[model samples]
Target chain A: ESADLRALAKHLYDSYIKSFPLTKAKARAILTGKTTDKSPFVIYDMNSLMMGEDKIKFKHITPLQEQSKEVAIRIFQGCQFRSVEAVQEITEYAKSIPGFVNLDLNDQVTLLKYGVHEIIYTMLASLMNKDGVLISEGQGFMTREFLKSLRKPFGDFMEPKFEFAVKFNALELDDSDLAIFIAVIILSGDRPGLLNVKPIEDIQDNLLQALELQLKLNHPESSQLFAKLLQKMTDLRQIVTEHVQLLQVIKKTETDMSLHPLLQEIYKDLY
Target chain B: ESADLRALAKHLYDSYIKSFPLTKAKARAILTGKTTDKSPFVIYDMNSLMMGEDKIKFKHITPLQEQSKEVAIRIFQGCQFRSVEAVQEITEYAKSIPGFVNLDLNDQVTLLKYGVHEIIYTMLASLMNKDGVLISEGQGFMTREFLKSLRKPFGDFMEPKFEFAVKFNALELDDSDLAIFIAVIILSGDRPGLLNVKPIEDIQDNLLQALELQLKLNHPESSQLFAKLLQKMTDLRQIVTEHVQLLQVIKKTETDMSLHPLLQEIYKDLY
Candidate 1:
């Protein structure tokens, strides 16, 4: 029924990836252990920001010392910012799909609440190099080694995703396949707290059908491509679970640093 | 498109649950101090079966001492047998659905390999009391306390699921809901290595649509019922990740007991 809508989803997704051009030069630099000006990805402003008083917002600033408690809070805040931006993009992507906004607003929020991390990780998979993710629109490269060097809980959170991403990249999914896959993930009717599931299912079904066709057209060499891609969603789920656990740890250890309001709300029902 | 098929899936699930009538007396006895003839759930015959010889198969036998290595193996083998039986029933349940058997055989295997434990645990949630699950078709009870008392690796494997089950039961999902939920889990197009993705997804879409209707019809007072149930799936995924980790531990530590071939195959690509 919504074939043209499905096509629009694919089109939007293709355009989304094009926006984040993979700078291989930057990727190569990170691979060769060359730190750029953006080395040590800054998550927060250490000197100025005060919790609950000053405008303690997430800053996509430079990385800092491993032992700094401020750095620990900044790492979480940094990821929280990344997660929020991705979710914002996904919301626009979802709205671009015809009839998505026609559903109840609450239903839409419910879908995003559950579906955001899955889509973010799926999109992040595109940025995955063997080493780590190409961050800050390929201007900054977050190396696996750099993530590993961070303090205990924060380091634990970032490293496993790289591990998952490296293996996910092994499947060699291209942009077209990933676009349809992301659409399917967004429109998943099974998201908890949904008010209108039938429409969501219908949209998801169209996306699934389109995705299968895209897989057939794109990866004829591999018969198991769709199944492997589906498995990646499962892997993403596991990775996010660990990610949430790390967030809980951060909330426990660093009570002084205020988590982003949106991040706090996201983690509220997660447990 | 496949609404009737979903209805049939729900029907088959309902009938399947009827086959395992939970006897309250036995459940009460287990809850109290009363011990059964089969005090401990046995996994294998330690006296006769050798690891590599005589095909030391998993048996749904009595429980044994926590201290003995043989008992440890037996506990796993016992759970393995139970898991196998649950999977077998689930396989039959899937087949009874209209177009399920029509999918490629390899696809069927892939779904079972990935989805079996998820469904088994879903069913286990149904069998849960305030304390623990009704083991062996309500013939015996496996207390959460006894499970906690078991040795490392084996105890580690069993305990988390009980915790999940207890929490899942708090959601108060009835059999009809579970029937559709299990169907959704089984027909999941994301199961790694699925061929004929369209048909599998078509079936899942049907299940999702039907499940939503069922939730609305059943839990009219609760607007967010479907969403809550779907959230339980995320919870289930977390629990299973812990389970596979325990399996990895068992593989590393207890090299003496042979994991069932089917189980080893499921765990192979899971990590």
Candidate 2:
């Protein structure tokens, strides 16, 4: 049960924050739609995302939102496209965990597939600080009260993250602490169909030890910091399940939507 | 471990079908938009869906999927509302599964929270076949290839469910079989935060035995039917996690969207 919290979290935590740094201010900036990728991410892998607009299709949905069905579908389509693309970036951070590649290649895929959502939401904390989540990469703010008004899966789907982000920010965790957090989430040994479970368990054990140490070193005042953070994991997993369900609901109506092949690969057998 | 698969599945199946029957043909029909709910589901819960548009709000998102921000948001918002409304109907069937109320009320909520998406997607099987899923409530159909073209999250989010729906249809399960199938999903013992865990374990234990028996009696020929079917549960869980993350991603973009209170309650703290 004992782990070398410092040595365990030492390099891995550093590696984690190298690519993805989390800060309350930066989290706020991105949530407000402040992200300005100089050029649209022309994704590297053809399977990563479909960039050509020509391949995209549309659907007719009768709803209280959107300008016209034509434009609405296109915008919705863009967000959908952007979502997978963004997840691709999130997954890149997962590779930073030392020994991730040392595990089974298939194990890597399963971890990425299973943990991508948790990591994405974990990163989302950097872009949020409780009251609201930043929109369009932080171009604006969406108050939590406003979200409850949307109803159903979206409300149910997001409200938890809203609650979570608020409480999580209260922890005062910065990117370095979160590096271990995301590492813990991704290197999870719990994924189904895992062949290399032992290495993963070892990795997670070290990560958790490091996380506890990090919490101890950083926020000694909050004795329950570790429990609270782990609880966030449980919450994240549950949230992801609803998101998958939301996908199916979206499917029934948005007949013409598309998914990137790799994204599709991740989602392939999920409910 | 033996269950009267016939008796076990009998009234429960009947009760399930009375509310929402699933046949391959009917599934196809609903997927394409023949769902004439006579009136737009002016959802019962004031907390369910904001029927009045005045309460609704919107945010600007730059994407390839919608028309303009206004119409696009309105359209997205309607789907958000519609999704929860429909889930109300889906959960109605869960109440029909006998002994549901016998368990803890809190247990029921956890089950619904954990299992609703699996059920919703399971219902989707009726609306699809290997070739495609009917859209606009079955007004049209969208093929697998078309979805992949849209790229990333939507494509990833949807295509796998598409694959599963296609294969699940091959099993030729009617509403009767699905009744048990859904009950199994809801009453699962694996859920978190369960204090009345034993009763749930008892419920699912019987449900699975009944399910195995049902598969034996119904399929007679397929040796792997039970395995294949249980596999669906694994798949469903993974899919739902992605759905939660997707909700977070959408949140970053759709700042003005709102969620129903009850729906929001379900999504509360899931990651």
Candidate 3:
């Protein structure tokens, strides 16, 4: 199992080097600029990475505990953490690892800093969000002059779908988790006005209804949160934002969901 | 061939559906509340997406003809004969394609939108500023933190890399294109802050040197300016931002980069 972890770490490390076009010398040069001192490469730092620790640190030279508190503190302070709690959690996690506890204090600190600066940043991004949404709008409701003939091809919002989902499970989410989940959802498009409490309740109902729909559409066994977890939100107001409209993809998905009367009302007043 | 294209489209469509999260009823409910309409989807007038002679309208539901006209004028106006000539060249290229010139005016308009949204968007991002300088800093620098950690594990500067590339490339890119590229570089974490000035006689010596070093380290191919080509810049930016420091993988890579002297200099002092 430990060997498997090292292999994984090495794989990730190799992938990073191959992809970025980085030279070892170039890397060393940059480090020197930061510390104003010479430094060596710490490649193959897989021992701890496989263990799933939150942070890692490396020393420029030997692990001289008595000689370099200043250098060590500087590096530690330079470490990036959004909050003190995060820092505590990281340290606590590191201490629990088997070999980490046995390492010298300096080595442990180095390990922590290295971990914080290297791996945590990337993993969180992968774990932070999932897929986005799509909507089909009808061409009938929009004004004649709204687009130049060329721009008018994709019509206004069609059958109104309130298709936003959570990045984390709302039922099991803590304040921090909810904040992150909401942040990711707001990225899809312009923030639709306030999240209606009724709409949220409505969403919950539709979540149950849409569960089967999503299953049919996506993999049934995948992390399908559509029905089970999504129905819980009663107010989405806290999550949506306005800037995403211009940034996201707005496509025409061919099929029109306009036959339903309830879906028809969305663009009447606005259109 | 059609089946393959359809499958590709479907995959993208699936991802889109997950992101938008709107059902026909919900969309209408969000828009009209309790109003009654005959259809579930809004009907857009037929001529929504096309305008005459190579112009595109991204939206047509609202009365925006005047705005669309203005934007078109802004894009094509004040052209050095070069801009005019470039369009001519592209039109000629389109003419060479069998059905390109014979397509329905509506289809032509769609092509134009796709061209602007895809090909042009990507081409412009790869281009460096006329000044032969590339700046990657701030968000750009932070984004590369992961790759830097893995390859160099000694020279961290993801944020600086982000800023430098964006600011430099922003010169030739429109607001939309520029925004997308910035997001791409940040999210992908592999844009080398490269401008092909290396082949140019008067290239910025420092940038060229940095790039050479970068190639050696092997970061992922990255560029926020070019990310719009994927039509997912909105979601990508949101994910990168929301995940911030919690993602351990990126942090691990970035941490490794921070330890290296050479890697750290790429973003350090890059204002």
RMSD of each: 19.4, 22.9, 27.6
TM-score of 2: 0.41
* Residue A187 alpha-carbon offset, candidate 2, angstroms: 50
lDDT of 2 by residue, B1-271 (tens): 3446678788777777665534555665554447665322222222222322222222222111232344334434444444454465565566667677667656776777777777778777787667565544443445556555443544565577777786778877766677788788888887778778888888788888888888888888888888888887777777777777887787776456444323454686564
Docking class of 1: incorrect
Model 1 compared with the native: what TM-score?
Answer: 0.42
lDDT of candidate 3 at residue A242, scale 0 to 100? 19
Evaluation by lDDT, superior candidate among 2 and 3: 2
> Which ranking of candidates, highest TM-score first?
1, 2, 3
List each candidate's DockQ score.
0.01, 0.01, 0.01
In the range A127-181, model 1's lDDT, one tens digit per residue, is: 6665566655554445567666677777898777777878877877766566677
Model 3 chain B poorest ten-residue lDDT run: B133-142
Measured on C-alpha atoms, candidate 3 has an lDDT of: 0.27
For every model shown, what is its TM-score relative to the native structure? 0.42, 0.41, 0.18
Q: Could you tell which candidate, 1 or 2, scores higher by TM-score?
A: 1
Compute the interface RMSD for candidate 2.
18.2
> Global lDDT for candidate 2?
0.63
Q: Which runs in model 2 stand beyond 4 Å of their true positions?
A: A1-271, B1-3, B21-25, B28-79, B135-155
**In angstroms, what RMSD does candidate 3 have relative to the true structure?**
27.6
Residue-wise C-alpha lDDT for candidate 3, range B1-271, written one tens digit per residue:
3444334333333432332233222332323335544222221211221331122112222111223343322211211112222222232233333333343333333333223222222332332222211111000111133223322322231232334445434433333232223222212212223233222212223222323233222223444322333344443334333333323444454321212111122132121
Best by lDDT: 1
Residue A56 accuracy (lDDT) in model 3: 24
